[PDB]
Design a protein around this nucleic acid. Structure first.
Ligand SMILES: [Zn+2]
Ligand SMILES: [Zn+2]
Ligand SMILES: [Zn+2]
Ligand SMILES: [Zn+2]
Ligand SMILES: [Zn+2]
Lengths: 303, 154, 379, 379
DNA sequence: GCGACCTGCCCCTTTAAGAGCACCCCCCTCC
DNA sequence: GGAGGGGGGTGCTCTTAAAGGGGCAGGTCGC
């Protein structure tokens, strides 16, 4: 799976002990945010830590994470380290989603400003350095799919970026329920089957008297029958199955702020207030750094 | 403090109404016949005319958008209590009215009026409004028609 | 159990004159005449200056999760949380079994306000009145304890300790605790304009309790005998006792299903005081408005007849083992009442949408002329 | 503050006639007169015929850790154990500040019996009195709350949440909780013959408080004037008000370090009653005999001067926020007293060896004429 | 030749608003 | 003291019309 929780745990332990060293020297005794009065210390083991402490540590970890040689980490690899940390938390009983939950909103902002400046690196030889975070890393880490409303929203955004080729928040807001037309494919491969796909007209032009309009131009969604879990069509259908009935058919927005509390059998997962520009920008920078999105951007951009 | 019930009729021509108490006779006469007045709704474009002072206060509700009545079940907002009372019938699933020919049950008299067209009954109706010959059965229905439609306005 | 038949003192070797309610100075204002002052005292004991901790350079949930009830108090191990609540009410119903069940339900209702549907442990505080004779103590207290344990059993928890002390008045209560993951309880701090409040139990239980105890005092009954017949008082008392002895487990479970933003309980301070306390907690600038006030049948008439004693129309009448004031979106609320009336598990009960949520300054009011809904005594 | 001037009504504008203890009817006969009945009531509360569940083919701790106090309830997560306690003591001293401190200490002392040296959360039941003036309530209750919170600081925890009620008598108490790992609490079940019991606090607090309450009224002081004077009661009363406001954190911590088998707190039921209750959950078939009792200064003669109302020598005399009745081996115990007398951190306090553990019938008894060792206040 | 899609028109139901009576509340009253 | 009159404002039942969603039925384009 090329995802190593051990590396994330080790980096966290190194940073935690390093900070604890400085915590005593400052001689500023500040209590921990737990019921019992204790000196604020960062537990070396991730699992036995409070939400506030973990959030504050991951916030500082962005700027104080140090490589094995003592050099600061690159923006392309801090995201991988944090993904490994989250995988460690998930596989040890914790239910905290360090990227989506409201308590960790502070963490994402700092991670966001670290990741925004990133650009693909070109070596002196010439070839571009491939990113260290891949799609399977997100899939295995449960940052994509249909586990929680935020994860499903991020999955739809990721698929839209990959296929429809949306590469900027300002350009990416244009998407709406109405203009995203669903049309069952006219030609199934065999009469027994019935192919389905989703399309979007991302072409910008005068669009006057059938000009600039053609069937082969507007961006399209494929369908994955090999693994239904990752199928874009299934996730889109699930998304529309949980959004409120009133939202469908409106031109203003496509992404809805997930409801704070949701249960396994909750009919509705999303509110009717579209996600703010800040959140869309925060969760779009994290999905450009991924490798497959970079390849998709290059292929369409190149031609 | 309820006084004993007696019935007194407004002897004035054109008003054959009989009231539940002698007390109410004075109020009826004063507020209906003797008090001849004209008012204008303050709204810039309403252009309506109401002789009573009670009616205007109700009319102000129409022009504004203050909804102070909330349904128990669907949390829908209404402007008057009786509108809510009619709405609640949807949630309780009760159909009080019923046609006397085909046994067709409805929730409101507006639905029944539509059904009577199938069982053509306007033939036996005698009343009708002078303007557009509406062919009503009873008398006060003509007043309701003149109020909702053919309105008296400036 | 006393559910099969009404508690008869003679059946348990008790005299006819005996009544459990005689061991409390009942009053129309409840167990707290100066409601405002007790709010100040509760704020004083809750408020802690060290908990701010320079905000921890971030925005995280507080130890006093909402500052008014059901403190969360995050722990060390496993990042779990410790939601814990306490409550105490003096006897208000003649039946000891039902009174113990009511005390247990009141103790548990605080947790169900936060969405917690499971209790690991519960404690009980049982107080025996000085005036009660020895022959009565060993005949009523076992019934109270049996009712408390039965209520705990229905809640999936066990009473496994407590304390017993002497008191001039019988004091009945407990303490409920639960250690839960961060995703098992709804922290009632979210609220957005457009939501609609939902209530799970009718109001006016205190009026029904007080009137039923006025059937033995000739001076008081003649004042109120005009407006309400004895049969109405009997059925209202029965309904209030049954309602007050009912758990909100189903409501708490459904809270998660229908995306609840905030919730509370109506135990004490009336409906207006609890809404006001809840409004201050909301992060956004939202003020509640209550248009409907479901009341037990015929109790509103008594409430207005007695004068400035209860004031249900003002939302100040205290309640015991009250319902939940849940803030849900409009369509979820529309569905919420439908499911709670006929649950899949069965044994449903009605719920009402009593108001709306609008942009304001973190306050709660009641319209000038609330639409009093008379809930019938169903079955 | 601890050494600050005692609560003076004139200083805080209250009239000289004010007296905090006046709000309750102190009963020198006992903390709760029907103790033999109330112990049965508490046993009924703690009893559960279903917790055994065929014993589950194991000698694991029951759902109740000992079935008497400080229930150890296993949790669903990480094999953690939930430990809770609750106490409710009416005012017995005239300083509101120390009363909150004493209430907090009494609530906590149950945990320190099981070795838990850390507390996670603490509630508080603060019941104001009907027979209390409006100004008195505003000038008394805040002091009690502040004292309780300050005592929480020394305990290493915080007071978050609680409840407030109206009660003819002032009621002060709370619930202390702790989610602790299996290697953090000492289960009182274990014990072995050849051990010696240790008491960390002196006896006779009830006698001192009652006698100091008797100073005001002149018709009762006369019959005890011969045995002691008012100066002797002042020192004894001050000492009792100082010991019963002292936490047992040091006792709890040293319990682990010295291989303590079992321990319990002497609160309410008296030393004899608490020792007997301790002997009822020992795996071994052992019994306790007390050959020595450390009664407060001059508080042994006074009980004789009051006939059989107190009964301190018989061990039935109640105590509040009493010490710990730790059972240690002979070799370890001698060092435990030495360590507690002269701690490295400071705040020295004395402990005594009172009795021996001998094979018997799982019950505790006191010798015919226990020796009384007089403890005088330190300087 | 058959179908999908857009749109128009009618059907039946629900919401909105006026009419008037019975009622309450307050105030005043001269016998 | 007082029951009766005057003045005012209001809820409730009835009635009608207007708005609206659903469904049947055309004309146009595609296969
Ligand atoms: Zn007339
Ligand atoms: Zn108008
Ligand atoms: Zn409705
Ligand atoms: Zn018909
Ligand atoms: Zn007409």
């Amino acid at each position: 799976n090329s995802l190593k929780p051990e590396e994330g745990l080790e980096v966290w332990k190194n940073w935690a002990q390093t900070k604890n060293a400085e915590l005593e020297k400052d001689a500023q005794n500040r209590l921990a945010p737990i019921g019992r009065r204790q000196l604020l210390r960062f537990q070396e083991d991730l699992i036995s830590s409070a939400v506030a402490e973990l959030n504050y540590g991951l916030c500082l970890m962005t700027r104080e994470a140090r490589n094995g040689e003592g050099e600061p980490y690159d923006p392309d690899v801090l995201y991988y380290i944090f993904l490994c940390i989250q995988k460690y938390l998930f596989e040890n009983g914790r239910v905290d989603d360090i990227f989506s939950d409201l308590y960790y909103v502070r963490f994402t902002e700092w991670l966001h400003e670290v990741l925004k400046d990133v650009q693909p690196r070109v070596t002196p030889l010439g070839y571009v350095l491939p990113s260290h975070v891949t799609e399977e890393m997100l899939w295995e880490c449960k940052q994509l799919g249909a586990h929680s409303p935020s994860t499903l929203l991020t999955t739809l955004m990721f698929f839209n970026t990959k296929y429809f080729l949306l590469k900027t928040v300002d350009q990416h807001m244009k998407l709406a329920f109405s203009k995203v037309l669903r049309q069952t494919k006219k030609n199934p491969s065999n009469p027994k089957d019935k192919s389905t796909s989703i399309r979007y007209l991302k072409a910008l032009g005068i669009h006057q008297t059938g000009q600039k309009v053609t069937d082969d131009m507007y961006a399209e969604q494929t369908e994955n029958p090999e693994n239904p879990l990752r199928c874009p069509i299934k996730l889109y259908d699930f998304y529309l199955f949980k959004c409120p009935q009133s939202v469908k058919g409106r031109n203003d927005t496509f992404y809805l702020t997930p409801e704070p509390v949701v249960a396994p059998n909750s009919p509705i997962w999303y509110s009717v207030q579209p996600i703010s520009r800040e959140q869309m920008g925060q969760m779009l920078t994290r999905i450009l750094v991924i490798r497959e999105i970079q390849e998709a951007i290059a292929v369409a951009n190149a031609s | 403090k309820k006084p004993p019930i007696q019935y007194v009729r407004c002897e004035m021509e054109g008003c054959g109404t009989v009231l539940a108490h002698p007390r109410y006779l004075q109020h009826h006469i004063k507020y209906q016949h003797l008090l001849k007045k004209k008012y204008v709704c303050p709204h810039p474009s309403c252009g309506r005319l109401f002789r009573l002072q009670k009616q205007l206060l109700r009319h102000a509700k129409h022009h504004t958008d203050q909804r102070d009545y909330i349904c128990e079940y669907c949390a829908r907002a209404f402007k008057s209590s009786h509108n809510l009372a009619v709405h609640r019938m949807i949630h309780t699933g009760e159909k009080p009215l019923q046609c006397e020919i085909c046994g067709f049950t409805c929730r409101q008299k507006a639905s029944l009026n539509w059904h009577m067209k199938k069982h053509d009954a306007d033939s036996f109706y005698q009343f009708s409004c002078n303007i557009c010959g509406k062919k009503f059965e009873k008398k006060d229905s003509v007043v309701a028609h003149k109020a909702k439609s053919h309105p008296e306005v400036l | 159990m006393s559910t099969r038949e009404s508690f008869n003192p003679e059946s348990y070797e008790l005299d006819k004159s005996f009544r459990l309610t005689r061991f409390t100075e009942l009053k129309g204002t409840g167990c707290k005449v100066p409601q405002d002052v007790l709010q100040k005292l509760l704020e004083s004991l809750q408020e802690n200056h060290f908990q701010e901790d320079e905000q921890f350079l971030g925005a995280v949930m507080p130890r006093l999760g909402i500052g008014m009830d059901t403190c969360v108090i995050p722990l060390r191990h496993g990042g779990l949380s410790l939601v814990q609540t306490t409550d105490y009410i003096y006897p208000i119903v003649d039946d000891p079994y039902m009174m113990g069940r009511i005390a247990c339900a009141n103790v548990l209702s605080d947790l169900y306000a936060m969405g917690v549907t499971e209790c690991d442990n519960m404690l009980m505080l049982l107080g025996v009145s000085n005036k009660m004779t020895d022959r009565e103590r060993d005949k009523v207290m076992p019934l109270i304890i049996q009712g408390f344990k039965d209520a705990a059993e229905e809640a999936g928890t066990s009473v496994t300790g407590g304390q017993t002390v002497l008191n001039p008045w019988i004091v009945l209560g407990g303490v409920a605790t639960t250690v839960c993951q961060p995703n098992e309880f709804i922290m009632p701090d979210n609220a957005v304009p457009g939501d609609v409040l939902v209530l799970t139990k009718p109001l006016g239980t205190q009026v029904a309790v007080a009137v039923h105890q006025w059937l033995d005092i000739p001076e008081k009954w003649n004042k109120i005998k005009l407006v309400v017949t004895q049969e109405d008082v009997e059925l209202a008392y029965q309904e209030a006792m049954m309602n007050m002895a009912r758990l909100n487990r189903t409501a708490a479970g459904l809270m998660h299903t229908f995306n609840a933003h905030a919730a509370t309980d109506i135990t004490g301070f009336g409906i207006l005081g609890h809404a006001q306390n809840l409004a201050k907690q909301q992060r956004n600038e939202v003020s509640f408005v209550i248009h409907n006030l479901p009341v037990l049948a015929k109790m509103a008439a008594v409430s207005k007849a007695c004068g400035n004693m209860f004031g249900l129309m003002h939302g100040t009448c205290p309640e015991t083992s009250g319902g939940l004031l849940i803030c849900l979106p409009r369509e979820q609320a529309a569905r919420f009442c439908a499911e709670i009336k006929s649950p899949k598990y069965g044994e449903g009960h009605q719920a009402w949408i009593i108001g709306i949520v609008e942009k304001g300054n973190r306050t709660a009011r009641i319209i000038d002329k609330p639409r009093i809904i008379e809930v019938a005594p169903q079955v």
